[PDB]
């Protein structure tokens, strides 16, 4: 599965002189390997996100449709995955 | 193009605390880790820890565990790297690197322990 | 785990020549994240090749990789006095994956 865009969110946009939510274009190539990637708070059921975006080159997303976080209990969950906004979905499976 | 400019040469005494920093361009700080490096003069390459920009988790290598500490300030694109309770044998070039893959290099601080 | 290299190989200009990098079966022999870095003296590392044989733009095709078991092996064609500089071999840093670099090998052409 070939990364052309992501789903973008910054819930820092503000400090971070960003904008807020759109697409993303991943900029890849046959020698340019790319992923989405979201990141986020979980307290206790209620789900924050951090960020969504693309990310670069990374052998822990390769050929993950799915985005799961599989690290147990962290404080910040992140997962990555291949496919066009293959981030809006997260899941965790510790 | 992709650049990694890194602060200036520290010296310090043993017992004492260095913050390195690593300023990210030409492409996204948040789209990718940030590796640490150190070299000893006329000694290998050796590995520190990563941190993940978007998350700020991170992970050391087990020789500077409880002694190393990863930071970032993604709104200026900067990644730090704190090295505490110096030794002599801590007088080393540090470098941070972008990705997994380390395809970029910043230029390297030099920290001198007398 | 450790990586091992020799600490040292020499060639002659125009020749080709390998330097080696030996890990274990649960590292080197598992997986395809062997890379490959260049350094000149006083100077910052250059990533030459990634995850065993990929060659990022920019880089000279005389430089190749390859593995065959826990052995994964630099190959430089057409070898150039610019080529002397030291060769360090290392996995890939982030996430699941902890970072480890190889001794390093001191690459020398005999005149």
């Known amino acids: 599965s070939e990364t052309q865009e992501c789903l973008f969110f910054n819930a820092n946009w503000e400090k971070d002189r960003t904008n807020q939510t759109g697409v993303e274009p991943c900029y890849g190539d046959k020698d340019k390997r790319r992923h989405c990637f979201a990141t986020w708070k979980n307290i206790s059921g209620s789900i924050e996100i951090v960020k969504q975006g693309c990310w670069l080159d990374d052998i822990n997303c390769y050929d993950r449709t799915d985005c799961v976080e599989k690290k147990d209990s962290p404080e910040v969950y992140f997962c990555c995955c291949e496919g066009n906004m293959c981030n809006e979905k997260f899941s965790y499976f510790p | 193009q992709v650049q990694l400019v890194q602060s200036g040469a520290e010296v310090k005494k043993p017992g004492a605390s260095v913050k390195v920093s690593c300023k990210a361009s030409?492409?996204?700080?948040?789209?990718?880790?940030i590796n640490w490096v150190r070299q000893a003069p006329g000694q290998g390459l050796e590995w520190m820890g990563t941190?993940?920009?978007?998350?700020?988790?991170?992970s050391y290598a087990q020789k500077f565990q409880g002694r190393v500490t990863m930071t970032r300030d993604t709104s200026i694109s900067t990644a730090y790297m704190e090295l505490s309770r110096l030794r002599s044998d801590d007088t080393a070039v540090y470098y941070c690197a972008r990705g997994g893959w380390f395809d970029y290099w910043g230029q390297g601080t030099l920290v001198t322990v007398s | 785990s450790a990586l091992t290299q020799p600490a040292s190989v020499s060639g002659s200009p125009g020749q080709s020549i390998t330097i080696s990098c030996t890990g274990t079966?649960?590292?080197?022999?598992?997986?395809?994240?062997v890379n490959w870095y260049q350094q000149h003296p006083g100077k910052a590392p250059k990533l030459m090749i990634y995850?065993?044989?990929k060659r990022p733009s920019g880089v000279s095709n005389r430089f190749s990789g390859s593995k065959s078991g826990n052995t994964a092996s630099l190959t430089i064609s057409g070898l150039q006095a610019e080529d002397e500089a030291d060769y360090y071999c290392?996995?890939?840093?982030?996430?699941?994956?902890?970072?480890?670099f190889g001794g390093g090998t001191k690459l020398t052409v005999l005149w």
């Open positions: 079966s649960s590292d080197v022999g598992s997986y395809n994240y």
């Open positions: 290392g996995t890939f840093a982030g996430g699941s994956y902890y970072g480890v």
């Open positions: 030409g492409y996204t700080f948040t789209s990718s880790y």
């Open positions: 941190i993940n920009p978007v998350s700020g988790s991170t």
């Open positions: 995850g065993v044989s």
